[model samples]
Target chain A: MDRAAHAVEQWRSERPDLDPSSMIVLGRLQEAALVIARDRLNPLFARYGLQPGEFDVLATLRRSGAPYALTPTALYDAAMISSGSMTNRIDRLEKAGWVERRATLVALTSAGRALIDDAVVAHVDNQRRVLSALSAAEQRQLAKLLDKLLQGQ
Target chain B: MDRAAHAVEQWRSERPDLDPSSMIVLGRLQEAALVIARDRLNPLFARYGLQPGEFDVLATLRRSGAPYALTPTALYDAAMISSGSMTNRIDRLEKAGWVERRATLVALTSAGRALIDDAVVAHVDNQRRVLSALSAAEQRQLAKLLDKLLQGQ
Candidate 1:
């Protein structure tokens, strides 16, 4: 059992009136995300000299099509990170020759575009392997359930 | 549609051969966790002058039963945080008069117990409201699917 299961067991014994079913589900939700990022996603990104957030910046640029550029505001909004953090990521990528600051825009360098284009393929493959435990139907169900939760919020 | 759905659409136009189904699922997984924490969980913690990590510490101690104490090493391990971070959290809690350092073990103060005993009730209620979008059956399925993913790892 995972920490959520253990925690739920403890809650049951300690406070009988509290129904911890929701905690169990949400706990598993958060834990699954953490484990996947730490064990699967971060390792793949590390092999490409990218932290997950940095990889997110590159991927955002790469998927936005040709010129592959976006302003720092747009980049930070897309990645859901603070501007300061985004600036630091952009700086690191710039120093590494993976990205460039062109006045108002941050554009992927040719090297950066090439790197993310290749890295994304591996990233998706890693995601596939991570989800292999679930059947295709289960994957769809999980996605749809999560979508309902997001939309409900 | 959410960012993942948007990103998957962009990928289809930009890189036709790569299937992004897994990316979409994992993206939603991460996004769901982020949104829940940012919008639902963090605000509740803030209202109590506690960060989410700090709340986790208090909750762990609260649920451990009697004396409500554990070593910093165990606390860090249970929280999946570094020892340094745990020490800082312990320090903050100590200053707040929420917990006390008893030799090697950190025990909850009466104030700490009172705070968390009330906060956890509210926390679990918030969790239930967060899941009201999903049917109980769907929630169970989601949890089971996530459990499968974590176990496979």
Candidate 2:
């Protein structure tokens, strides 16, 4: 049994009055996210000398098209992290020559663009492997269900 | 549309040769987990004077039946956190009178038990509410799909 399953079973025995069904979904959601990020994604990102957050910053810039620049506010908001944390990532990327500050906005350098362009292809492949256990149809269904869940939030 | 959907759309326009379907699933999974934890679980935990990690410790102890004690290593492992981070949580809980150290084991005090026992009831309810966006059948399917995903890991 998974950790969430074990917890639900324990709750069933320990607090029979409580319906612990939701814990199964939420627990597994959290666990699966953590495991996939730690075991699958981070190692892959590390290979390109990038942390996951740094990869996110690069990917965000890469996807913005053309000049590939975005203000730090836009970057942090898109990345869903604190401003200071975003600053740290930007600083690290700047030091690594992956990104540069252009007045008020941070833009990917030529090296940054080249790096993420290659890294994202591999990142997508890694993601495909991560979801290999689920059939394509199930993957679609899972995404839809998660979207619904998020919409309700 | 959500961030993942927006991202996938951008990827389609920007890098049409690379299939980005996997990004949708993984992105939504990460985003949903973050949203639920930050917006739902953390607030509910705060109500009981607990952070999410602290609540996890208390809940782990509570569900372990009587005596409610486990070694710090066990606690850290169950919580999937670093030893030092777990030590900090234990220290905070101890300071708050929620837990105590007995030799190498940490045990929940009566106050800790009372706090989590009450908090868990609310926590489970919050979890249920979080899933209310999906049908009961959808909820079951989501759990099954997530379990399958985790099992492969």
Candidate 3:
């Protein structure tokens, strides 16, 4: 049995009253989803001397179409970080000449654009590699399910 | 649009060459899964004075059938950690009287079993709450995708 299944077996033996299968499945699913971020994707960001949060701000701005800017609140919300941490991320990206603040919007600088342009190409390939375990159909299936869960937002 | 769809749209606008949909989908899934740990599940472990690594050791031993013990190598493999880090985790748990190394096998103590027994019930509840976004069918669908992705093992 896999670890989760084995754990469920233990729970069934030890505490027959509590249903532990849901815990095992959800717990394992959560753990599996996180593996790629730490194992593969974060290294690419690190190579660019950018942490994930820093890269997140640049990527968000870079992808936001023309003008390539967003309010701090929007940036933080999209990146799922606190406003305080968002300020720190902006500070670091600004120091690296990858981002700037215009009025209240965070925008990618030309340097940031160039950097992310190079970085994102490789990052996309890395995503493909990390997800290679799942077939395209499997990936699409997983994505739709995730979208369903995320719909609660 | 959904967050991933919105992100993909932004990327398509700015950089049509690289496909960002997969990255955004995978990235957001990873982020959402991790949120449960940091926001709710981890605190349960913390209450028993255990970090994830430490708690993982206890849980592994607890679920490894009877005797509740394994060699350092086995423990590390099950918990997905390097031997070096396993030593540190064992040291901390041993210090807390939660585990003991007998011969070459690491086993949980009564205190450890008691602690994990309490910790796990709450943890399962927490996992259920975290996954409440999905229906049972959706959760099963997600699990099948995860199992497919995990089949590399």
Candidate 4:
């Protein structure tokens, strides 16, 4: 779990015969993402009675803006849920009065919109707290390097 | 959003003033990963009737080789599902003959184990395809960089 731990030694302990150098970094990313998300996002989700997937759905709509409506099919595609899972999520949020489905489309109701708005403010604030440690310039530099990694083959 | 798009212009449009530089790399990583995962992961899940999360659980267990048991809590934590959601997933996997439940734990049946073993091989092959553009060495480097991002101060 410690990034400082030699990747090979740790992997040997956890999954020997697997090449640690090969898997360690990827494992670390998922692990780190999980930790960060857990530390920040989970509490935010809890405060609003939203799960990560639900928050993802709402956030996608929120950023795209009002009416916040998309077809269940479209939402499923964007949110990366199956139709059935979308239906179930919609059902739960609806029962909780945070979302509603209107004639073939799903949209955030007033309460639903309110919920995600709260979540965004909280999420943004939380993100800023961790990220702010890095200067704006440093953050930009970091993001740039990351972009280069994934860019141009 | 194409990777080729100018970075500042892109993030300024999508999330103006949210530190475009940071967006540059981080955005690309997430987006590119999704693009790759969509191509490699989604269809396999569809073909095997495995949800992405289900594949995660089964694969985690399969890699362990035998006595493929993990508690619902461990499985949910590893796979990042809620208690209720894990229950639903286990239910579906069990019904399909790919998995089963112990008195209080989840385990892969022989059929399930065999399927997942094959699926894991296929999944890794698929993963390797998406990752092929990056030398596996580059992936290790990317992973290391990500580890820093996750654990860095």
Candidate 5:
């Protein structure tokens, strides 16, 4: 039996009225999501010389347009980090030659652009691997529901 | 704008051929899952004087049957933690009067049982709260798809 069903089997038997459905299901989903990100997915990012945090910044810059630059505030907001943390990341990324702080903008170096270009494809492939268990229809179903939930958020 | 959509809007504009559907959706799901667990749901466990680690052990033991016990092997398997980690968790919960290892069985003490009983209800409440962004039907749909994925795993 899966973890949730086993954990709640007796609860269902003893307290038939109390619904543990959402707890068990959401708990498992959340856990699965963690395993996917931390183990299966982020290692792939690491293999590409980027952290999950950096991957977003690199990706955000690369996707921004030809020059591939943004203000520090915009980059940090895109990556969902605070100002200090974003500054630290940019410092490291600059040291690594993946990003440059030029006056008012943080732009990707050619090296950074090239790295993110490769990493994003591999990143997508890694996500495909993490989600290989689900059928296409199941993935569609899950994505649709998550989008609905995210819209509410 | 939603974070995922914004992250990919520029990508979609420049590289219309690359399928970013999976990466963007799965990335958001993983981040949202992390927020739900670490930020929203786990604080509820803290209020009950239980760490998330202790909460899992106590809940597993409580749900293991009438005697509310299991061998360390069984308990660790339920929690999907390494035996060494489970050992540390058992020590912590034992310190907190939530569990006991009598002979070969790791059993719930009365204190453990009472706390978990109350906490399980609250745990479910917290998960419901985490998912409150979705309608019951949306939650059920999400659960069904996740169940399908878990079964495939």
Candidate 6:
């Protein structure tokens, strides 16, 4: 609600003629998402015995439809992480035996594939639980709308 | 793409079986949004000569209704910003001639309101242009779904 208030203050200066109520609604929504990401998503990642980023890497490999994985530079760009962070992530994934360096390729192991399959289920379910307040219809609606705000690209 | 790549590496260890393609798609969308936010939202603030955080605070107050006001403490809580940040935002907003202190209450002025109205219209139009790749119905669908991701309290 305070984000709403803060937004109103600016809107007063920036766009006083428009309705400000919408800002409060939208601002608070954005704030709430941050809370869920930090509080719920991070903890869930820990509970699953995985660094949150680790699951993403393996899933990417498995989903690539067989071998032919990406390079560190490419991975770093995609991960929105520093090159060093990407290196560390790969290092940890490699150490876990979930991934292997096939020459230049970073591919998933059989165990890695099996593990991610389970993790995805858990992750999706966790997301559902975190958003439990919304019904399936509501979820669909919100997801659809966010996709627009998201650029639907 | 790099962001997606980093996430893939990080999660590969934890969940090797999940599909990473979806991640690529999702990551790209998220990246696109950040790019837009930086230019569209952030710069808009810069033009009005408002810091991003300050714009948020003033906008919040401007939208609060007839009196165009809210307390500094209330602004902090709603924005999920620290009280210190709120204080800083208020100090800046007041200096900008976009807002002022009304005893314990803070309110927007005619100049302040005008800035927000223009900025929001421009922002929405710019966003709509970015969103135009999708059909209006698609945009609505995306918005609806995002609403779900946004659901809380």
Interface RMSD, model 2, angstroms: 2.6
Going through the candidates in order, their DockQ values are 0.57, 0.59, 0.42, 0.18, 0.43, 0.21
What stretches of model 6 exceed 4 Å from their correct place?
A1-33, A43-72, A80-125, A131-153, B1-33, B73-84, B109-111
Q: Ten-residue segment with the worst summed lDDT in candidate 1 chain A? A: A76-85
Highest DockQ scorer: 2
lDDT of 6: 0.58
For candidate 6, give the docking quality class from DockQ: incorrect
Regions more than 4 Å wrong, model 1: A76-84, B76-84
Question: What C-alpha lDDT values do all the predictions have?
Answer: 0.86, 0.87, 0.74, 0.59, 0.75, 0.58
DockQ-superior candidate, 2 or 5 = 2
Candidate 1 lDDT, tens digit per residue, B39-112? Answer: 99889988888988899999889888989999987776565222136678889999999999998899999999
Candidate 4: Cα lDDT at B14: 49
TM-score per prediction, in order, is 0.92, 0.93, 0.84, 0.58, 0.82, 0.56
Q: Write the per-residue lDDT of candidate 6 for residues B41-137, one digit (tens) a residue.
A: 5676687677667766665565565677888766665553332456666777777788888989988888888886566666545545555566666
lDDT per residue (tens digit) for residues A86-115 in model 3: 677788889889998899888889999899
**CAPRI-style grade of the A/B interface in model 4:** incorrect
**Candidate 1 lDDT over residue span A1-153, tens digit each:** 678888888989998989987977898888888788888999999999999989999998998899999998777666522224677888899999999999899999999999999999999999999999999998898889888998888
Candidate 3 differs from the real structure by a C-alpha RMSD in angstroms, to one decimal, of: 3.2
What DockQ does candidate 1 score? Answer: 0.57
Better of 3 and 4 by DockQ: 3
lDDT by residue for model 3 over B1-153, one digit each (tens)? 655677777788778887775765576577556555566667877887888778778877887767898998788666522223678778889999999989989999999988988887887776777678888888887877776665542
Interface RMSD of 5: 3.4
lDDT of 1 at A101: 92
Give candidate 6's total backbone clashes: 86
**DockQ (0 to 1) for model 5:** 0.43
Which 10 successive residues of model 6 chain A have the least lDDT summed? A75-84
Candidate 4 lDDT over residue span A1-153, tens digit each: 453244335335545534334334334544544565567556778887888668767765554456688787667555422223667777887788877778887788888777776676675566665555555665555455445434432
Query: Which candidate wins on TM-score?
Result: 2
Rank by TM-score, descending? 2, 1, 3, 5, 4, 6
